[PDB]
Structure formats: C-alpha cells, structure tokens
Structure 1
C-alpha cells in the first residue's frame, strides 16, 4: 500500500507516499529532528492527519526538493493532504474546513525596476 501524493508551497515541490505502519517521517532518507532545524513547526506540520486521527497508522518517508526549511515544511503537510484524500476520501471536508488542503497560495513578489527591491520605493529628500 503506497498512497502517493504531492504538495507544493513557496517554490518547493514535495512528493510523499503512504506506507502503513506508524507515524514516522524520513525526509530525504534521514531523521526529521536532524533535518528540520528547531522542532517547533513539526507539530504544526502534523495538523493535516490530526483531523483524521491517523497518528499510529502511516509512515510517509518524503522526498522533498527545493526551497527552504519553512518551504520544505508547510509543503509536506500539504504533501500528505493530497495523499490523505486517497486514504480517507470521505474526510475531505475535515481538511477543507481546517487548513492544509488549500494550495500554494503565494510566493515572492517581482522586483520592479526603478525601485530598491520588491515594491519598496527608495528614499528621496525633498518632499
């Protein structure tokens, strides 16, 4: 059993799979606490399968790609959310109402020319 979902946020793609077992993540073939830096946002990263209560059910073992640590995280909780709707397909409203299953809504904004960087206009003296 391999329920393989994908997930994107902030220029960082994250594809997951779901092998049965218990809750244990193997992001880039290594431990999460030695890969994700400070362990705070991991309990916010466990929010999507919290509402389906499949804690001791699924090992995931993500292969992540690109971005940063808050771009790799917040993309595997969106990663397994596309995979949780092929594990519990009737539980789509439990994830739609609370968070995870929305999107990659927003990335960095374009630097316009004639300007310092990304909508921050430069200082002028004489008003």
Structure 2
C-alpha cells in the first residue's frame, strides 16, 4: 500500500503520524484512543479535521507520541493530519486554511521572573 507521514508539534510534545487509508481506526502507541485520553469525550474534536477535510472519511491511523500532558499531544495529531492530507492532495488546503488546523500554534509557557514563586502568583503590596 501507500503511507503518508507528517509530524505534529504542540505544547512541548512531539507526534509521529502514520496515516494509511482504510475504514478508519486509531491506536495510539499500540493502544486505543479511549485507552489513552482521560476521561475523555473530546476525540470528536480530533475528528473535526475529518469532518471539514476529507468529508466524511476515513483513514486508518497509527501514532507514537511522548512528552507533555495529554491535552497538548492529543491536539498535536491534527497538524500531522493536515500535513498528510495536503500531501495527499492540495485541494484540501483551501478547506483547511479557512478553519486553521494546519498552523501549528506558536504559543507555549513563559519563563518566570521575580514576582512569581512555587505557584504562578504575582506579589502583593504593603497595606496599612
């Protein structure tokens, strides 16, 4: 067969996408998506790239991912999805870029500076 591979980066995490057309089924790290996301019922947001792009679908997916919390990496899949769907055909880019899902976010945490401490709280003043 044929396989399309594009990376996904978000929130100090890394995604190695393996996209192969099919009936549609994902097993992240040889483990199903429901077996990897707490709780969670937000995988339909991960299916939005399949709902607006390649309507309705679907393609089988295998992925290996490590680093960062579950939200940042469960959201890193979509940019690899978009890259692979653009690699498949440039037609899908017009529907992708009007909604995003390809532009990898450039926003992460910030350093820390005097005023913050063990918890991310600013200091007070001397009243009275």
TM-score grouping bracket, smaller chain normalisation: 0.7 to 0.9
Q: CA deviation at 1:16?
A: 0.3
Secondary structure of 1:80's aligned partner: helix
Which residue of structure 1 aligns with residue 93 of structure 2? 92
Q: Is the 8 A contact 1:19 1:59 kept in 2?
A: yes
**TM-score, structure 1 length as denominator?**
0.87
Q: CA deviation at 1:57?
A: 3.2
What is the aligned length? 127
Secondary structure of 2:8's aligned partner: coil
Q: CA deviation at 1:48?
A: 1.2
1:97-122 CA-to-partner distances (Å, cap 9, x unmatched) read: 11211112211111113533697421
Q: Is the 8 A contact 1:111 1:117 kept in 2?
A: no
In the alignment, the residues of structure 1 paired with residue 120 and residue 65 of structure 2 have an alpha-carbon distance, to the nearest angstrom, of: 31
Q: Is the 8 A contact 1:49 1:84 kept in 2?
A: no
Which residue of structure 1 aligns with residue 108 of structure 2? 107
1:36-63 CA-to-partner distances (Å, cap 9, x unmatched) read: 1123220011111222235543111111
Query: Which structure 1 residue ranges, 5 or more long, are not aligned?
Result: none
Pair 1:117-2:118 in alignment: yes
Gap change, CA 1:39 and 1:115, over 3 Å in 2: closer
**TM-score, structure 2 length as denominator?**
0.87
Query: Which structure 2 residue ranges, 5 or more long, are not aligned?
Result: none
Taking only aligned residues, the RMSD between alpha carbons, in angstroms, comes to 2.0
Pair 1:66-2:67 in alignment: yes
